[PDB]
Design a protein around this ligand. Sequence first.
Ligand SMILES: O=C(O)c1c(/C=C2\c3ccccc3C[C@H]2O)ccc2c1OCO2
Ligand SMILES: O=C(O)c1c(/C=C2\c3ccccc3C[C@H]2O)ccc2c1OCO2
Lengths: 148, 149
Amino acid sequence: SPGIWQLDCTHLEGKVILVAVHVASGYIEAEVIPAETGQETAYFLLKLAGRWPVKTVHTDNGSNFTSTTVKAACWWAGIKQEDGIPYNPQSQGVIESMNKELKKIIGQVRDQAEHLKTAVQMAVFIHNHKRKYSAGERIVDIIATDIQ
Amino acid sequence: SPGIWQLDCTHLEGKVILVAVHVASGYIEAEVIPAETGQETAYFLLKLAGRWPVKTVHTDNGSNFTSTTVKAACWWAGIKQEDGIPYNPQSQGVIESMNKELKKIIGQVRDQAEHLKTAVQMAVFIHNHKRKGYSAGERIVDIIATDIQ
Ligand SMILES: O=C(O)c1c(/C=C2\c3ccccc3C[C@H]2O)ccc2c1OCO2
Ligand SMILES: O=C(O)c1c(/C=C2\c3ccccc3C[C@H]2O)ccc2c1OCO2
């Protein structure tokens, strides 16, 4: 549970926002890319697993599940790559709701930055710091409890 | 102390590696950029502060200390921007030693990736997971969780 993350890909301004959500906390990291390829998804997972103890990733679609580049980065970083099937259906709606929330945040900061990637990082910041404890607090508590 | 980070810039293959080190743990994040500008450093700090509770950053040089874009991102993200002067001089050597270790890791993985940026992220990974026995990644999470609680 502390090591489980979900990939999610959403579209804005003709670009792709790739998101990794730490399932137990709601904590996110995200990046803007021109389009979702295995190459970009593999690089993004390497960055994520170098920063947090990523044990399991539920991939966002069958192309990234299949991708031999994604499989190679999962092997390299010690990550169990799984499918993203919402066997519990509440998962479908939870990701949908996060994409809407994120885009709503993005629209609240959009005029403060020239480039989409900056507005996405401001949104990552606002999402992780929002008290609901924040997601950022929750992930650190979860993983610290796991270490002890 | 849990909120204090140090910026560090080093050079490799004609490119720049920008590093933020969490001083109490030794945990790092890093990126490759074509050259260190206020613009890149501001964007890097925004990314960092969206991911960890960054309270204070000791900037790596007076150009980033002065940069109005860097000051704007520090204001936006709630970060206290400070100079990076090694008032304890053991700081000068500690950062040098980190750049040499990092570059050594980079040379141990370099042939596994076409692009420098990938080898740098593999080095970030190996550095944060190295048990020295707790790893830096363990240390930063323990420090911050202690601080929340
Ligand atoms: O070769 C690259 O630099 C490269 C690669 C390649 C690999 C890679 C990347 C991550 C983890 C292990 C590995 C094993 C390795 O094959 C993949 C995506 C990228 C890359 O550049 C940006 O997106
Ligand atoms: O305008 C951008 O998108 C942009 C900016 C601009 C700002 C910015 C960036 C971070 C935090 C607050 C702010 C306030 C804001 O002025 C700066 C660097 C960049 C950018 O693009 C990538 O590197």
